Write a protein that binds this ligand. Structure first.
Ligand SMILES: O=C(Nc1cncc2ccccc12)[C@@H]1CCOc2cc(F)c(Cl)cc21
Ligand SMILES: O=C(Nc1cncc2ccccc12)[C@@H]1CCOc2cc(F)c(Cl)cc21
Lengths: 305, 300
């Protein structure tokens, strides 16, 4: 029993964290095979970030300008190139701890574990979701750039995020491992704002199923709804529309608990129109939206890595 | 910026997880140097659960009864001994991934990361606090016994918990790595109940400081209180009494935010009296008590 916000074991990713220093900037790099990936803004000083021409800044750099440190051993950079907002530093040593891995781009609503690092050293692991506005509500301090987000599928690490910056509201923005930003954000010191965030409806439904699995069932009601009527109500409370794909993904949880998706939708609908009435669900007074249906199945069944 | 429930990186502990099988029971073991630590209840049968005599059950066991598996390699048990409720299986191979480590017994209110494992394989990492009633509100399924709780302050792992059982209310009980249970619990299937749980007051205060550091101020007020008046109010809400030790530990956060401890105590009293009025603190509608003052300083 119990339901916790749970991250993937971080070991396979810790063995890849290095420190990348270029001039006065020090941040984190991800060492996989003979390549170290890090944010391209490491090549920027103060003036540069205001209006940066990364291609021109990188052409002025040499391999020796990049100081890469893996543990207490300095790696020698033998090549450098840029792929979108990520800088790829070719090194002369392949990481002996390189796990089986893939670079994946996730969609809003998807969750992942973040290994927050400082000076190439892992300091914490936490779970989060890619918000519908493409930000993450992370916990990052100065020096955390280059920290990565990942999922594990069997023994394969899927790297999906690399931390680049903190927006004025305290939320975070970054890219996939190919340097493409999640969201309408740029790696430049300029006025940027995240769009109005919405609630990940399919994830709230999955968490309501986790609560029923754990014996917390007061919010259940006799009612059901159409997907169209539910979406009309959901739009009014800044909840993402629920698609037939989402109803299908919730299928196993529906079968396990005996509560149809549209039956659970009518419970969520009443929760939005009337509140929790002084009650909690899984020890929470707010509806949690950072657990996907897969996360609920994984945690409530005990899948290992 | 931002404030998350954050666990320590689990890598140093994953390299220590092994599977321990005794007859029909399979659970997790912690392999450090040439010793595998696991709950002694792995040696129990069906009839030896209501009132097992562990000393007598262990004397009837031989090294070849214990099957230890580290990854896809079977380890050879060359000795066995018991220390309180923990079984110690001496093996013929020292774990090459043994990190710098210590065994520490924690106090209620202290937090730690849990690496939940099944069949010696890590499945998840989460952050927990030792409740004032000495249980943990974990997330554990059958087979999770032997999963450990730890903290990693620097490069040294302080193992503080090993999971033993789930109580009837769904909360969990276990021991330090010397086999001593946290709480008035025994590793028997006898009638056991956790005491009424209370809120870790010092941790809520630390989290209110984390919120101020992150730009939350709506809950602040112009009041201060005495420690005695605060304790009289807080205890009516099933909150733990706040001691002078707790006021002292909150000192650096008080200095950093410019809000005295007793000033923050008066904010907490008002939060308890009014509720949150539709507002949240650090994205939460309830007062969080699983962040210690040390966790807040470290994360912020
Ligand atoms: O965001 C930045 N680093 C931080 C990241 N995460 C968390 C933080 C918390 C506090 C202070 C910095 C934090 C850097 C420095 C500030 O300016 C920029 C601007 C940029 F366009 C980019 Cl791509 C990066 C940065
Ligand atoms: O609690 C137990 N293991 C579990 C742990 N955590 C989570 C669970 C979730 C579901 C089912 C078992 C779970 C075992 C089996 C049940 O009875 C006992 C009794 C005992 F005295 C001891 Cl020391 C252990 C156990």
């Amino acid at each position: 029993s119990g339901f916790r916000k749970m991250a993937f074991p971080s070991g396979k990713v810790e063995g890849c964290m290095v420190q990348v220093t270029c001039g006065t900037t020090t941040l984190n790099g991800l060492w996989l095979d003979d390549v170290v990936y890090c944010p391209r803004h490491v090549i920027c000083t103060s003036e540069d970030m205001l209006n940066p021409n990364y291609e021109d800044l990188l052409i002025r750099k040499s391999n020796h300008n990049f100081l890469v440190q893996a543990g207490n051993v300095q790696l020698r950079v033998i090549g450098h190139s840029m792929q979108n907002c990520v800088l790829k530093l070719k090194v002369d040593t392949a990481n002996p701890k390189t796990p089986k891995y893939k670079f994946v781009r996730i969609q809003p609503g998807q969750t992942f574990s973040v290994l927050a690092c400082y000076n190439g050293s892992p300091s914490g692991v936490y779970q989060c979701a890619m918000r519908p506005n493409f930000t993450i509500k992370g916990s990052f301090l100065n020096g955390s750039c280059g920290s990565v987000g990942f999922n594990i599928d069997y023994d394969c690490v899927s790297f999906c995020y690399m931390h680049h910056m903190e927006l004025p509201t305290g939320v975070h923005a970054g890219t996939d491992l190919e340097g493409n930003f999640y969201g309408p954000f740029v790696d430049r010191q300029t006025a940027q704002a995240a769009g109005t965030d919405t609630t990940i409806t399919v994830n709230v439904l999955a968490w309501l199923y986790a609560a029923v699995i754990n014996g917390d069932r007061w919010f259940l009601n006799r009612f059901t709804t159409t997907l169209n009527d539910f979406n009309l109500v959901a739009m009014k409370y800044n909840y993402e529309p629920l698609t037939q794909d989402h109803v299908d993904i919730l299928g196993p949880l529906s079968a396990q608990t005996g509560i149809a998706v549209l039956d659970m939708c009518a419970s969520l609908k009443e929760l939005l129109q009337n509140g929790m009435n002084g009650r909690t669900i899984l020890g929470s007074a707010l509806l949690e939206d950072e657990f996907t249906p897969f996360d609920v199945v994984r945690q409530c069944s005990g899948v290992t890595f």
